[PDB]
Amino acid sequence: MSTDVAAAQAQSKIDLTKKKNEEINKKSLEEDDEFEDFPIDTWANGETIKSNAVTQTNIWEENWDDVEVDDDFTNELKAELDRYKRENQ
Amino acid sequence: GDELTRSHFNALYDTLLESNLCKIIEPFECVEISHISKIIGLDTQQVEGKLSQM
Amino acid sequence: EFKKLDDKPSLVDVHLLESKVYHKLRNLAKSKASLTAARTAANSIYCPTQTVAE
Amino acid sequence: RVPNYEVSEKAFLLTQSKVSIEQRKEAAEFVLAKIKEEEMAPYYKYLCEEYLVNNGQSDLEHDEKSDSLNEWIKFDQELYNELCKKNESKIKELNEKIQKLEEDDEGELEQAQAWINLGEYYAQIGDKDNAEKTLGKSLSKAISTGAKIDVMLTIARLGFFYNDQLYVKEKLEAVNSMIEKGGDWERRNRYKTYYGIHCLAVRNFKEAAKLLVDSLATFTSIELTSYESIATYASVTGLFTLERTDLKSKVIDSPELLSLISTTAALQSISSLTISLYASDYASYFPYLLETYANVLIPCKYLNRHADFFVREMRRKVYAQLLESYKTLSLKSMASAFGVSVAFLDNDLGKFIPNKQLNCVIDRVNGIVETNRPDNKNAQYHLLVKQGDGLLTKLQKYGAAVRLT
């Protein structure tokens, strides 16, 4: 579990005996692991992580969607509605 | 009745328009489209559409 | 099939038809390729005036 | 082998229920005829897994939802029995033939080839796990490098068949390694077509364009969805990636696209749009955009991920080109050119402008649209610093890491 692309930070530091325990010490300092407490707290598996296709699981390159609206519905109405105003003028 | 004369009369029309349009507006900058449409011998909207593509 | 039965000056015609079909399908790549074939085949001397005209 | 790709495509219409009513009906009957005849029964069961309370469901061998607009996917218990009959009988007979060949001598040729025949039967009926293992035996035995490529490709087809992209990804990496080692051009053509469609299913259509233009020039049809769909794929990527001039020369550098003419609804709808962008028709353009959504994106397996993504992007392009060519426009006229009303037009534009991939502003008092895109020394300066910042960052972390150790 790493932030953004994992391999970019995996190469930055690998396993060393000096730092290994020190890694725990920082985590313990903040107090929790903070990825296992949120499910207990909410008291059910979220649906706000299934809020978009990418939010649950991303095996894609980010679209930049986070609003996800079908735009074919509104455009179809735009074309026809404009046409009527002109026809009834 | 002949596909070839229509084809190469459409091409000739476009390249003829192109040579003329450049030659008009060469000693210019911020030239009104009304002037251009007169000299080339076409319409104001027609002039705008060709400019866009070029 | 008439390349197993090749003795034919009548495939010269078939090449020229082939060129026209491709031209109207608006590919000139293989209209040129067949037309080139037809020129080669008529270089050999048996061809009517009509055939050379086509 | 060849039958798989037709079945999946029709099956994707049953997966959807946002498609046309008569279209989905037709597709169910075709799939049912070939469930009887070619054993497509394991993959029919695979369709309900892809639901569980989702539309397009009606199964009665599994979970039902006749609330779904699809009610032509319904199983029969004749179907459940036909499955089990053929499945067992065929595996048993075909295997016994193979066992005999193993007894007899020569394994270089005879036995590896015999194992290919098992993996083609499982490929056909949609068993991925069972195909992989037996074609796993063919590869183990030393053979031609061209054959090894052919086999990996048969396996790669199966990932699109279930429409699992991860399975393809993995497998096409082994093809790339062995494509040079064989050095065969026969299957070099196939590989680009496969890998083209993987790029199509993910968001990088730029790569897809580069592989699929090669696939026009030479197409390899076995195990690969038919040539009218391949035209439709080249045209999709063409609209997204290129701009007027480039687009025009691409489809005149492909004679085959024009000579194939529209011979299917999806091909028609994409091709209508191709012309209008490069001919700089805006008038009929705005309707064609709607047609492509309906008849290409949702019916297609790989562009159904791109249904919202495509429409959003394609509108930027058509506006972009017009605004670059103009210092100023009037809004009412710009609205008329496309065929929308004035107020309607802003809304689409107003999502594109702050992302700043359209570089413009809109006066609502003059009613003029201002274009204040640098295209001079200032633009090159603006781009460069982002890369040079990137270089600073790369060095900041790597520098620290080596010094501490």
UniProtKB/Swiss-Prot annotation, chain A:
Q: Which Gene3D superfamilies match?
A: 6.10.250.1210
Residues with the Phosphoserine modification? S12
Residues carrying N-acetylserine: S2
Cellular component GO terms, alphabetical: cytosol; proteasome complex; proteasome regulatory particle, lid subcomplex; proteasome storage granule; transcription export complex 2
State the source organism's domain of life.
Eukaryota
| Alphabetized CDD domains for the sequence | DSS1_Sem1
Q: Which residues cross the membrane?
A: none
Any other noteworthy remark? Present with 5590 molecules/cell in log phase SD medium.
Q: What is this protein called?
A: 26S proteasome complex subunit SEM1
Give the encoding gene's name: SEM1
Swiss-Prot record, chain B:
Q: Which cysteines are joined by disulfide bonds?
A: none
Question: What does the UniProt entry list as the effect of changing L51P?
Answer: In rpn6-2; temperature-sensitive mutant that shows defects in proteasome assembly when incubated at 37 degrees Celsius
Signal sequence region: none
Post-translational events: N-acetylated by NAT1.
Kindly state the subunit structure of this protein.
Answer: Component of the lid subcomplex of the 19S proteasome regulatory particle complex (also named PA700 complex). The 26S proteasome consists of a 20S proteasome core and two 19S regulatory subunits.
Additional information: Present with 16800 molecules/cell in log phase SD medium.
Function description: Component of the lid subcomplex of the 26S proteasome, a multiprotein complex involved in the ATP-dependent degradation of ubiquitinated proteins. In the complex, RPN6 is required for proteasome assembly.
- Which protein family is named in the record? Belongs to the proteasome subunit S9 family.
State the protein's name: 26S proteasome regulatory subunit RPN6
Source organism per entry reads Saccharomyces cerevisiae (strain ATCC 204508 / S288c) (Baker's yeast)
The uppermost taxa in this organism's lineage are: Eukaryota, Fungi, Dikarya, Ascomycota, Saccharomycotina
From Swiss-Prot, chain D:
Q: Which Gene3D superfamilies match?
A: 1.25.40.570
State the Gene Ontology BP annotations: proteasome-mediated ubiquitin-dependent protein catabolic process; ubiquitin-dependent protein catabolic process
Family annotation (SMART domains): PINT
Sorted alphabetically, the keyword list is:
Nucleus, Phosphoprotein, Proteasome, TPR repeat
Post-translational modification Phosphoserine, affected residues: S58
PROSITE patterns per record: PCI, TPR, TPR_REGION
Annotated localization: Nucleus
Q: Name one GO molecular function term.
A: structural molecule activity
Q: Where is the PCI domain?
A: 204-376
Pfam families this protein is in?
PCI, RPN7, RPN7_PSMD6_C
Q: Would I find Magnesium among this entry's keywords?
A: no
GO CC terms of this entry: nucleus; proteasome complex; proteasome regulatory particle; proteasome regulatory particle, lid subcomplex
Broad class of the protein's primary localization: nucleus
TPR repeat positions: 112-145
Subunit (UniProt): The 26S proteasome is composed of a core protease, known as the 20S proteasome, capped at one or both ends by the 19S regulatory complex (RC). The RC is composed of at least 18 different subunits in two subcomplexes, the base and the lid, which form the portions proximal and distal to the 20S proteolytic core, respectively. Component of the lid subcomplex of the 19S RC.
The job of this chain, per UniProt, is described as:
Component of the 19S cap proteasome complex which acts as a regulatory subunit of the 26S proteasome, involved in the ATP-dependent degradation of ubiquitinated proteins.
Any further remark recorded for this protein = Present with 51900 molecules/cell in log phase SD medium.
Q: Which PANTHER family match?
A: 26S PROTEASOME NON-ATPASE REGULATORY SUBUNIT 6 (PTHR14145:SF1), 26S PROTESOME SUBUNIT 6 (PTHR14145)
Could you tell me what this protein is called?
26S proteasome regulatory subunit RPN7
